[PDB]
């Protein structure tokens, strides 16, 4: 859903690291693979470092980063992870510039 400020669409692991390079703790983006669109990941800045998390899909189709917290839509998953880290190194707050 490229309408969201945090959804960057087809961007690479390496480009994500450049896009986050001047961010702070909690700067993040969600990205798609540029070869296989459908593999989506979260890249998240924390203390100078960028962490990458594959967004997994469950049997019933729900999206999750942690088994215990699964959502119908990607916006719901991001919104949840803005209030509880729940598996991530920190909470999601500041979209990387596009």
């Amino acid at each position: 859903l490229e309408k969201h400020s945090w959804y960057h669409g087809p961007v690479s692991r390496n480009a994500a690291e450049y896009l986050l390079s001047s961010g702070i703790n909690g700067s993040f983006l969600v990205r798609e693979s540029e070869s296989s669109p459908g593999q989506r990941s979260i890249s998240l800045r924390y203390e100078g470092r960028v962490y990458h998390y594959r967004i997994n899909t469950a049997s019933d189709g729900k999206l999750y980063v942690s088994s215990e917290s699964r959502f119908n839509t990607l916006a719901e998953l991001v919104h949840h992870h803005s209030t509880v880290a729940d598996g991530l190194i920190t909470t999601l707050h500041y979209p990387a510039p596009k």
């Binding site: 702070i24 703790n25 203390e47 509880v84 909470t91």
Partner: peptide, 12 residues
């Protein structure tokens, strides 16, 4: 919290 931050979250 790092010395350059001026916000935090608390959960659970």
């Amino acid at each position: 919290v790092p010395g350059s931050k001026s916000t935090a979250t608390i959960s659970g």
